[PDB]
Design a protein around this nucleic acid. Structure first.
Ligand SMILES: Cc1cc2nc3c(=O)[nH]c(=O)nc-3n(C[C@H](O)[C@H](O)[C@H](O)COP(=O)(O)OP(=O)(O)OC[C@H]3O[C@@H](n4cnc5c(N)ncnc54)[C@H](O)[C@@H]3O)c2cc1C
Ligand SMILES: Cc1cc2nc3c(=O)[nH]c(=O)nc-3n(C[C@H](O)[C@H](O)[C@H](O)COP(=O)(O)OP(=O)(O)OC[C@H]3O[C@@H](n4cnc5c(N)ncnc54)[C@H](O)[C@@H]3O)c2cc1C
Ligand SMILES: Nc1nc(=O)c2c([nH]1)NC[C@@H]1CN(c3ccc(C(=O)N[C@@H](CCC(=O)O)C(=O)O)cc3)CN21
Ligand SMILES: Nc1nc(=O)c2c([nH]1)NC[C@@H]1CN(c3ccc(C(=O)N[C@@H](CCC(=O)O)C(=O)O)cc3)CN21
Ligand SMILES: [Cl-]
Ligand SMILES: [Cl-]
Ligand SMILES: [Cl-]
Lengths: 500, 491
DNA sequence: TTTTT
DNA sequence: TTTTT
């Protein structure tokens, strides 16, 4: 396989810059004298989880409705407080570091287009109105978000701008999804409660829009005395962390488009994606696009166009389709977050299921700290805390284990994923947790995963567990799955099914 | 005949009062706001059938040099109810709607505009008009519930299909407190009304009503402004009010009733004392039918309350009218938070109980043959007038759910057919609340009869056979004097 | 019913 | 906890 730490993408920094230039050139708006800018005044572009220049409608609209743009990112102190119910760190060190890399790359890429990124630490509803006043901005453009916390910030910013006068308007633009909200065959209040019904409808009745093309010249900015430093984690009360084993994701749009190139074109792996996507070990088994999608470093419309080109130039098969099937799951949970609102975060979930659930700290800590006694579980939980990533197969398994085998309040698992995952997204995280916990609005199915069966089918040689739990390396297949207590450790709970 | 027009003003008195109200609130001139070169716009009316305090109308006017107002008679409005298939719009509300449209056209014409009336789906009508007239924009008020928001989607996509350029602009209205001014996003709306009320009263201001110029013209050149469709064309047999309150449709009549209730009769200052009554126009504002169609707005009502508090009296009753309008806002915002759970058997909380849909039981409730005078008189008033007292609505809801054990949506859908003031937010909001399937309650029929109809005058008015009887037997008559009871009382 | 003893 | 045995 290779026992080195695996950079994602694995491209050299010079390969990344070359691919980035070619990609930006391929999708560039071939000049635009037709767009009228003169006399349109100053605008502020407020970045959140859309840290890219490519295929960015908020940026396009800001540019087309102004003569001067002030791009701004606010490091919101609330991002580094604690989680809602159980008070874990709101943002763990690994995602914190990924965010900083995203910001460094965004500033660099904006500079290539005649702009810069203003960085400030503080609450957007305090920073943005002050900037709008100082620079005389007519508008603040930003992407629309869906969940409670984010929409509350939108309200506070809008009310803040109002409080300094009329004129300055907050303009929120839909983004994030492969299928556009406005193009759906239903309002989101009537979103089907079954995914298959949603997928069939959009596939039959909708089209995917082309990527928005962005000009190579986006300047000028206003005259700014201090563009601000990239913040450091220590200032935010977070101890920096470096990956010591496994995958080391690299933040930013440049690296993100680099990974699309790497996975699709250089390694030619898209043609077998459906075959390998239930793997757990290494970068090759799946796209690994999720951290870049969560921060908006890349966009699904861009990915879809790359898939289209791959299908023309190389091959179209069930694997080239399945990547889109999975991006449609991302769309679904995004839209479902609007339909469900805060019931997405409640114990009973969307259908308000009753009864039970332990919050035993000792049990939870054994799951969190990879000390359950089941190698399959512990390896996954160790991968998570070490790298900020876990395989899709692993996420499903550790969810079932915590809910069903341990009997724990599922929100303890969801909030720990919120702390740890580079790709943390409230819609996808709480969506999949409620789905896996059996508290979604989807019809009743008892989705119990057998740990022994999962180990045999998806880690048949014990390669995955041996990688993360190196004391198991010397053992053959069967002991890797079931090592026994002295070699490994005690089991904290019995298994509900598939032998105790 | 014992028929009471609401308001009790002649058509000419209504005109006089409306003129004075329009002039009081008129925007004094406005050459300042420039219009020239701004092109054609379409104003799409739905349940906002007024000129006063209309932000959709003002924005359409300020962003254009020419305005085409349109109302579409949507055929889906005259199909059937969702679960139990009663008429989607009953004859009495249908008649009220047509009167509102005639008045709106009149009031728009007096401002140099007109009203284009077409029968059909907005998503088919509006894009065609946009294209033919070269409209840059279609302005309309934003709605909150599934059916209305689906029409918004279909119109938007229909405009995209003719081309880019033509944009649908949806404006928040309807409420006393503005959505954008709330101290929380609607996803975090308090599940208890009292917390909502205390929050908005402490942290929000009520905006001044939007003032409208007296001259709004011109319109485009239009060949046929369209006739008002008859109820018979739409598959509804006309119905007249044969007894009780006869509400008069339109903004003019609505502003007339505000004048009548507040100023002519001076009743606002006792509103809280009288509001649990059931007989006659005097006991409450009776604003609801005009509010439901948007013939009047709560910001205008608040401005009239302020003036009354200055020119007449301020006390607990003058406040209480605002308290109740805040309930209207709450259910509107709750419709967004709850979505379609507002219409489901289990409600927002998804309660799992057991509920009969027995057709025989439901019909004795519907047709005022329960054998309980208080219940039957209220149900008769509803079917005869399209209105029922607030006190009555609470009682008949309690009776249907708890004494008869019926699926509450049967009663909610019957209200949807009959009520002049039908509003999905307020109706299904109040039914879920009353049925105990709300976000956060039994009525004793005998107690209610004694406390809110002591002399039996209400039941006697609607139930002719009780009129001869003394109050003792008006409360509890019996089989021979009235009829048998279809179910016993739970308590 | 995406992925599930 | 609008009105509530
Ligand atoms: C308990 C649990 C929690 C999860 N939390 C998150 C989360 O916080 N953020 C997140 O992005 N995904 C989450 N997922 C979904 C999924 O596991 C990850 O998106 C996936 O593992 C990322 O790896 P990849 O990019 O190589 O995925 P691929 O298999 O290559 O899929 C391609 C893309 O499709 C999307 N996708 C794939 N599967 C899902 C899915 N199950 N739900 C939604 N989108 C999907 C992602 O954008 C992903 O990048 C969660 C799943 C579970 C079971
Ligand atoms: C089962 C049930 C169903 C209802 N259905 C509707 C409906 O479809 N449409 C509707 O407008 N009202 C509905 N209501 C609320 C209320 O009964 C009526 O608004 C009221 O009777 C109208 O009479 P009024 O204008 O004279 O009220 P007033 O006592 O004079 O109150 C003034 C205004 O405040 C508002 N208001 C008062 N009470 C309520 C309330 N409980 N909920 C919301 N707003 C209120 C109304 O806009 C009303 O016009 C319902 C109540 C119940 C119990
Ligand atoms: N990025 C992100 N955005 C979020 O909105 C979010 C997360 N992450 N992670 C988990 C938290 C928890 N979420 C919650 C959980 C509960 C309520 C809630 O119950 N609110 C009440 C109203 C206010 C109150 O009384 O607390 C409700 O009735 O909905 C809201 C948001 C928001 N969640
Ligand atoms: N004016 C008005 N507007 C409405 O939206 C409305 C009324 N009146 N009167 C009652 C009906 C019933 N309402 C309903 C009831 C159920 C769903 C519903 O359950 N929809 C599904 C998705 C579509 C489906 O599967 O049927 C859902 O999951 O929410 C929607 C609207 C809309 N209601
Ligand atoms: Cl976008
Ligand atoms: Cl308005
Ligand atoms: Cl009467």
């Amino acid at each position: 396989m290779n026992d080195h730490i695996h950079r994602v993408p694995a491209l050299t920094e010079e390969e990344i810059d070359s691919v980035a230039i070619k990609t930006f050139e391929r999708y560039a708006l071939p000049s635009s004298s037709s767009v009228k800018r003169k006399g349109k005044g100053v605008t502020i572009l407020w970045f959140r989880n859309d840290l890219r220049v490519l295929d960015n409608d908020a940026l396009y609209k800001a540019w087309s409705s102004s003569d001067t743009i002030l791009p701004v990112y606010c490091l919101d102190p609330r991002l580094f407080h604690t989680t809602h119910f159980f008070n874990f760190p709101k943002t763990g060190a690994l995602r914190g570091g990924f965010l900083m890399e995203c910001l460094v790359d965004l500033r660099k890429n904006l500079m290539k287009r005649g702009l810069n990124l203003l960085i400030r630490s503080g609450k957007p509803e305090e920073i943005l109105p002050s900037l709008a006043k100082d620079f005389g901005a007519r508008t603040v453009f930003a992407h629309k978000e869906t969940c409670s916390e984010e929409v509350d910030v939108e309200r506070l910013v809008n009310q803040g701008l109002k409080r300094v006068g009329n004129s300055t308007k907050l303009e929120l633009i839909w983004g994030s999804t492969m299928y556009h909200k406005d193009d759906l065959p239903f309002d989101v209040f009537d979103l089907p409660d079954v995914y298959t019904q949603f997928r069939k409808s959009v596939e039959a009745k909708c089209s995917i829009r082309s990527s928005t093309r962005i000009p190579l010249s986006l300047g000028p900015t206003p005259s700014v005395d201090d563009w601000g430093d990239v913040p450091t984690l220590e200032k935010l009360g977070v101890e920096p962390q470096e990956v010591t084993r496994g995958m080391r994701f690299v933040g930013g749009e440049s690296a993100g488009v680099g990974r699309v190139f790497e996975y699709f074109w250089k390694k030619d792996l898209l043609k077998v994606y459906k075959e390998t996507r239930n793997g757990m070990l290494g970068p090759d088994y799946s796209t690994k696009f999720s951290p870049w999608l969560a921060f908006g470093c890349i966009s699904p419309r861009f990915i879809y166009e790359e898939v289209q080109r791959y299908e023309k130039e190389r091959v179209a098969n069930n694997s080239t389709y399945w990547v889109l099937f999975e991006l449609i799951w991302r769309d679904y949970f995004r839209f479902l977050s609007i339909k469900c609102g805060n019931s997405l975060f409640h114990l009973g979930g969307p259908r308000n299921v009753q009864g039970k659930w332990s919050q035993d700290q000792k049990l939870f800590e054994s799951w969190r700290d990879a000390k359950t006694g089941y190698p399959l579980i512990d390896a996954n939980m160790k991968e998570l805390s070490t790298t900020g990533f876990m395989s899709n197969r692993g996420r499903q398994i550790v969810c079932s284990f915590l809910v069903r085998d341990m009997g724990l309040d599922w929100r303890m698992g969801a909030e720990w994923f919120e702390t740890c995952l580079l790709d943390y997204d409230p819609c996808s995280n709480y969506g999949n947790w409620t789905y896996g916990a059996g508290v979604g609005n989807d019809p009743r199915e008892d989705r119990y995963f057998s740990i022994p069966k999962q180990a045999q089918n998806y880690d048949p040689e014990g390669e995955y567990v041996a990688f993360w739990l190196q004391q198991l390396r010397r053992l053959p297949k069967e002991k890797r799955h079931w090592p026994g207590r002295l070699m490994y450790m005690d089991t904290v709970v019995p298994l509900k099914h598939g032998n105790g």
